Amino acid sequence: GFSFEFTEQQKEFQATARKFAREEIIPVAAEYDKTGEYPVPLIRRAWELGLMNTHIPENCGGLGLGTFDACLISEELAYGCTGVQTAIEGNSLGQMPIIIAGNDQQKKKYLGRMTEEPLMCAYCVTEPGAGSDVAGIKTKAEKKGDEYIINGQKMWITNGGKANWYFLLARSDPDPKAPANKAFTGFIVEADTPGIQIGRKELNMGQRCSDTRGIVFEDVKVPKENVLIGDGAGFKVAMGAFDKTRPVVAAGAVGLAQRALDEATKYALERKTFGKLLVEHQAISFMLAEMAMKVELARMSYQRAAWEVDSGRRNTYYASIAKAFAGDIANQLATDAVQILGGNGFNTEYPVEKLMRDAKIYQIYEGTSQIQRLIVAREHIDKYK
Amino acid sequence: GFSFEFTEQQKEFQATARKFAREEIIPVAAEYDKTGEYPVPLIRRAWELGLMNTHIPENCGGLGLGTFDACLISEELAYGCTGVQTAIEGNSLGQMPIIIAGNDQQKKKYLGRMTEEPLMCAYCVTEPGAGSDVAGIKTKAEKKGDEYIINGQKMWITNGGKANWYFLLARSDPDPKAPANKAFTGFIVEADTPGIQIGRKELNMGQRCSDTRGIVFEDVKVPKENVLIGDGAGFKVAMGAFDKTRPVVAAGAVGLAQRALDEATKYALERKTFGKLLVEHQAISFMLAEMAMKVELARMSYQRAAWEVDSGRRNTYYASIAKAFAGDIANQLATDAVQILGGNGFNTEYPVEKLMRDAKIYQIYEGTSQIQRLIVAREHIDKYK
Amino acid sequence: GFSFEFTEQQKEFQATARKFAREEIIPVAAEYDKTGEYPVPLIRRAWELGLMNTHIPENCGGLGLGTFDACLISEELAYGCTGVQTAIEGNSLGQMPIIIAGNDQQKKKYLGRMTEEPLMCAYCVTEPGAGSDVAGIKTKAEKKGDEYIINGQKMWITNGGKANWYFLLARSDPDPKAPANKAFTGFIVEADTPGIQIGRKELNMGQRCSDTRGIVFEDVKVPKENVLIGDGAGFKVAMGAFDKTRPVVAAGAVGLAQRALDEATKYALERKTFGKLLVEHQAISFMLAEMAMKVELARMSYQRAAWEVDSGRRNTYYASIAKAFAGDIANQLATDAVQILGGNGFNTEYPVEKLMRDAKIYQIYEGTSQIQRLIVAREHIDKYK
Amino acid sequence: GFSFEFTEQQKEFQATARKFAREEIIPVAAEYDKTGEYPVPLIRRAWELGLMNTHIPENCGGLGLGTFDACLISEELAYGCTGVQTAIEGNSLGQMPIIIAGNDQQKKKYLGRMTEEPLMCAYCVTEPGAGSDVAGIKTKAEKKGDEYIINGQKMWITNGGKANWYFLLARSDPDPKAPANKAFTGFIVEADTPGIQIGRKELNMGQRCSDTRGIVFEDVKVPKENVLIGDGAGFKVAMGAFDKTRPVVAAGAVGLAQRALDEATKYALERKTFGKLLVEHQAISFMLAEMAMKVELARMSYQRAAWEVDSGRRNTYYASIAKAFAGDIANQLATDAVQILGGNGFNTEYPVEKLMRDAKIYQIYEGTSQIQRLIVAREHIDKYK
Ligand SMILES: Cc1cc2nc3c(=O)[nH]c(=O)nc-3n(C[C@H](O)[C@H](O)[C@H](O)COP(=O)(O)OP(=O)(O)OC[C@H]3O[C@@H](n4cnc5c(N)ncnc54)[C@H](O)[C@@H]3O)c2cc1C
Ligand SMILES: Cc1cc2nc3c(=O)[nH]c(=O)nc-3n(C[C@H](O)[C@H](O)[C@H](O)COP(=O)(O)OP(=O)(O)OC[C@H]3O[C@@H](n4cnc5c(N)ncnc54)[C@H](O)[C@@H]3O)c2cc1C
Ligand SMILES: Cc1cc2nc3c(=O)[nH]c(=O)nc-3n(C[C@H](O)[C@H](O)[C@H](O)COP(=O)(O)OP(=O)(O)OC[C@H]3O[C@@H](n4cnc5c(N)ncnc54)[C@H](O)[C@@H]3O)c2cc1C
Ligand SMILES: Cc1cc2nc3c(=O)[nH]c(=O)nc-3n(C[C@H](O)[C@H](O)[C@H](O)COP(=O)(O)OP(=O)(O)OC[C@H]3O[C@@H](n4cnc5c(N)ncnc54)[C@H](O)[C@@H]3O)c2cc1C
């Protein structure tokens, strides 16, 4: 029957993640955000505690955890800080295509190294000319004997300057009229290959401690063995990685919203205006109640999506619902929390403004809200045929 | 661990409820709403199928089902029609205080009769002067020997003119300064007792097939044996019945929203404007996607509340969250569905306008949205102490 | 410079309209809505006071008032009742094409009769197959000598069963690929012409005292003199009547919202819950403040649109903005007012539920909200070319 | 009658302000925001063009413009940059109490200096312990012979480190039970007086080019001639300055929203996704239409408030409505504009993220949204007595 109770192992994972977050990430998150420095010690500590690369199977040396455990761990880490959590989950996002569409040789070679030492990997799909239209990318992969020549440029690549290897999606079919199901090929490109020109670090409004760079490929030689299932099969692999990665980003948004709610409540429990405690004004109490409702609903949505994908079904409908709702409620919670603190909320010495700046990408990256609504509408309509 | 899978018995209950609803209630719901007639045959059929009085324990002849099964059955029935579902759930709402705070004699006497024949019961708490302020009622219960003399009037009583017996909450303590925890007493009052004057049927905007009447009590003699746990214990019983009844009304709102979404989608799949199908306009598709998201979130919320109360914990926080969110999304879905059908939506020969009229009470009765937000804020604040 | 002060004549018109509304329409509006009877005495009284057919020029015997005065009068009448105001403004809506695109003979013949006696006219454009897509109508007008043969059916015609003559828009060009600018012709069709089959009165959710019927045309002979500017010029006339009619319906929505706000405030000033006046709870006060803000903004928007059209400019942008915003805020205000009254709000003996039922058409008829947003987006984009 | 047409002088002022903004402020606004430097050259240029200190009467050497002209100028400047506009309007905010409650000597002495050279003034009311509760300030002013000794600290003072003199509000009455109407006194305190300790520059989320500092007063001697109307009259002066200053900040929010809308539209007119221009997707077009509607409504609201105060009436109701609505729509427009640009919107090399960061204070300073709703509710309720 229905159940909303964690297992003992999941409880242990949640306790470890919460302890690590609230005892390591929080004391230094503000400094890392202010300086924009890459949190190498925090990433190493997360790797040591087994909070990173959770999806790697036990055969390759990983823990082989499901998406539910990854979601709860990512929620705790995002409660810690969203930039650090994004940097950590970039590894899982890059690894997912290799895990789901890789043979034994590729899996061992490109995941045992991740298990042995705290390395990083990226997910190079987005281009300057097409970010939402995945079929609109123009990076070309030309086959030359036993190698592929890749030319093009990618933009907004998380861990672009820190990754050990990249998952690259390029258009193998030169025919513009070729269908998207047979035109794109996935590759495993090492970061040290000649011809890769990593661009400057991009400065963003939020999550300033994470590394986001543009990458330019110029006559990069990729061996034939570093190809996925085959030519023209890249698009399906890229689209199938989303079904397992979207609940994680939804969980991160939920954790950010939970942090904002905690800060707002803790501030409202001590501030006094008009001779009464700030929580004794009905407007503030109703605001807090609505924030709590949104947080609980978003958490339930992402947990449902994670359980759905973990059970072997397709969770595109639930994953899109959870991602969209979490992205919206994260921004709403962040702005409400900034409103609650008043003038101190607008100041940079209080955590709420950082959360407000960080919450914006959850409506942009990993599929914008409009794309999520498109997917939800398509699935809903298909349910009526 | 977490699970979102029904049991086989729950699947059978859901199948029976859906079949009964969509094959009996729907063909006659419009006529019953238009004429305002009490749906006696539908209530009898629901009683025959075991879809009514589900909370009665097996000792008294009932099925002894949990609130989860009641919630799913009520969702299916509300998909059928909200007026019929409200009339059916009035029995459970009236019976809940007797089930949770009744001795063997009272339980047998006042529940075996419900099991044997399709009788009805009501829940008389609300007064013309105080509906939300439960502590503000002024019906007085004066003890005279081995009987209680009750004087006062109640307003907005579901099944007021059809109930076999009433659950009455009256203020036993005449001291105005007495605390609410020791001032109110619950009673089991039969409908045939002299001194009970049932008023005229009230005409409402929606759910016009349900019976809602005001009741006037004038020197009604109630035997001492028809009293609950004791004098001054009525308030806690009344407040504890809510923890088990609110998920049911939330499920009813969810079912109404699901009906509205189904009607809107089915209409949008055939209507053509500007040379394209009505679902091919991005505005309509986004509207449908948001409606589906709201429906799924509300369903998950009420299911979580039902599971929480079924596990022995206190679910006031989750029940209030589910009730508030379902009440809001029901009205939003109803008005969006009326918008989708255009001019035909405003007409009375299409089901959407009836749903829009019916959806309003879910933000009013069984605790208004403001009271739900008050409860949610109180629980959230208590979680931080 | 800028000014927000009425003229003395406009103040006199507003005073007369408010007095007539609040002393005649309100005492009988509930009865007319409940019985669905056509308010003939109220229409006659409005005609006697000069509150109807305001756009007729002084040459034809009318008052020759601008759209600003019509807007304020319609706002007062809609504060009285929306059904009566809709029945009254149907005359102006039907007459506007004749006023703006009629020669002296047609204007005299078909407006002097309106001036002399309280007659009615309708606006037959919408068809069962296309209501929003005006270019999608399929009523055909075939020229036969000095007459036009018209075949087709219209749906949702205000004053359909009471009009003395109709303004009919039909597709003269049989070529499906013909542009909309040269395919439709406008006609002045008398209601007594043989071949016109008025259908049954349609029953709607709100404004039940207004007459809305479907009309079937079967070989109706229209003389050549009853044609507007010429063949293929009907579409531009129909689209230009909107620029002068939309502010009036926006004003009606504003008046309905003002009525809802007045009822909610007057109820909240006497109701007491939890020992305090209902207006002393911050939630209720904030709700009332937001309602007042919305009412004021909508009033300013429609007044701006009326002034813009009265100054000789094109006000499509402002008219669409005002119509959309007023339509939204009317429904929001109505549902908030129903929420404020609590259980009494859901009852039919209080005016708020009638306002909630009536407010829905302002998001449907005279251009749905989606069409208004389309027009606003088109104008906004054109401003950037 | 009603009019929405500017005068020729107002058109000239608007043209000058728009030219200055879009040719001087925009090219350097990003650099000033990034470095946090005080825009001295821009302030000097605005002073030279007569765009600063507009409220000073012609007797003291000012232009003697009404609040309408100040509102339009501030809207243009805020379209330029919100930080520069805030720095400029700080002078008007500080000067307003002196203008409305100053004798000839004080007006000449403390406004002729502003006219002669580009000096700055501040408005010191807010304290660390009470920002919204103006009656809750605790800065004490003790009279000692012909001087006042002032002790206390102020927080969030615009132009705190750059002002030539301050308007200080202090509690003269030491009795805690004294009414607010007779307990506070206003002072004109020069910035060079010994005992004034200007704190460090505060770092905020947005408007980082404006100077906001905390000020500590320690035994500051203020001569008796630098007092306003008298002891206990400070509170009314402070509350009356709001009626003339709130429309200006509302206009600034409107200008920021207009800038966001312009950027979003200009980007959407060139970006192509899924083979179509980004403005050809109905979701984006509807978003733009709603943004334009909000901008127009907010502009009309603030213009109405400015005209109302310029006509000699009290505009507290309209000023609060305009301030609240403009503050809300500014944030909504900013976040929608960031959403439209997608990934580029989150980057710091595009203007939208700066607007999103800047828009937050319009819901915080000069009266938070909750205080505005309180004022609107109070005025609305008083209208019904
Ligand atoms: C901090 C950050 C980190 C990132 N990390 C990664 C990473 O690791 N890997 C990676 O591959 N990418 C990454 N990205 C890129 C991200 O995935 C894309 O930028 C995002 O999916 C949208 O890209 P875009 O701005 O080009 O969208 P655009 O298409 O340029 O946006 C246009 C706007 O219109 C909307 N829109 C577009 N098409 C439609 C339509 N058909 N209907 C309706 N609305 C529509 C969009 O929602 C958007 O608001 C990152 C981006 C950021 C900001
Ligand atoms: C169709 C129908 C069936 C019903 N059936 C039953 C039944 O079977 N049994 C039964 O006992 N009752 C029944 N009721 C009554 C219902 O439970 C109450 O009417 C409802 O709880 C609110 O009653 P009220 O209108 O008196 O609320 P009021 O208190 O009169 O409403 C005042 C308004 O202010 C708000 N408000 C009140 N107090 C506060 C506060 N402190 N803070 C903020 N906002 C506040 C409320 O939300 C409401 O909008 C029924 C009502 C209806 C319409
Ligand atoms: C009470 C009443 C009185 C009326 N009186 C009159 C009258 O006097 N004269 C008259 O001519 N008509 C009248 N009408 C009809 C009215 O003008 C039309 O019904 C209305 O414009 C919409 O008609 P529809 O339902 O066919 O719209 P539909 O097009 O059938 O509605 C489809 C739905 O999709 C939306 N939609 C449609 N096209 C698009 C698009 N391209 N993009 C996005 N969304 C879209 C619509 O907003 C709507 O929600 C009346 C209607 C009513 C209810
Ligand atoms: C950039 C900036 C510049 C500023 N410049 C100036 C300046 O030049 N001069 C000046 O005097 N001040 C200035 N201020 C201060 C500003 O005026 C105040 O900070 C603001 O009015 C609110 O202050 P607060 O944070 O103390 O509000 P708080 O009262 O501490 O905020 C508490 C929260 O609860 C809400 N709240 C409070 N009371 C109630 C109630 N009764 N009911 C409901 N909700 C309530 C508030 O809206 C807020 O969200 C500036 C502030 C900033 C950020």
Residue numbers in the entry:
A (entry chain A), B (entry chain D), C (entry chain C), D (entry chain B): 36 to 420
Give me lines lifted from the publication on this model.
Here we report the use of single particle cryo-EM to identify multiple proteins from three enriched heterogeneous fractions prepared from human liver mitochondrial lysate. Using this approach, we were able to simultaneously identify and solve cryo-EM structures of nine different human mitochondrial enzymes: short chain acyl-CoA dehydrogenase (SCAD), medium chain acyl-CoA dehydrogenase (MCAD), isovaleryl-CoA dehydrogenase (IVD), delta (3, 5)-delta dienoyl-CoA isomerase (ECH1), aspartate aminotransferase (GOT2), glutamate dehydrogenase (GLUD1), mitochondrial superoxide dismutase 2 (SOD2), catalase (CAT), and mitochondrial aldehyde dehydrogenase (ALDH2). Functionally, the three acyl-CoA dehydrogenases—SCAD, MCAD and IVD—are involved in beta oxidation and amino acid catabolism. Finally, SOD2, CAT, and ALDH2 are all involved in clearing toxic byproducts of oxidative respiration.
MCAD has a relatively broad substrate specificity but has highest activity with octanoyl-CoA. An FAD cofactor-bound MCAD structure was resolved at 2.69 Å using 18,616 single particle cryo-EM projections. Consistent with previous crystal structures of human and pig MCAD, our structure is a tetramer consisting of a dimer of dimers. The overall fold is similar to that of SCAD. The substrate accommodation in the binding cavity is determined by a network of hydrogen bonds among residues Q120, T121, Q242, Y398, and Y400. These two helices form the edge of the substrate cavity, resulting in a deeper substrate-binding pocket in the MCAD structure. Several of the mutations identified in newborn screening of MCAD deficiency, including the most common K329E mutation, are not within the active site but instead appear to be involved in the dimer–dimer interface, which would disrupt assembly and limit activity.
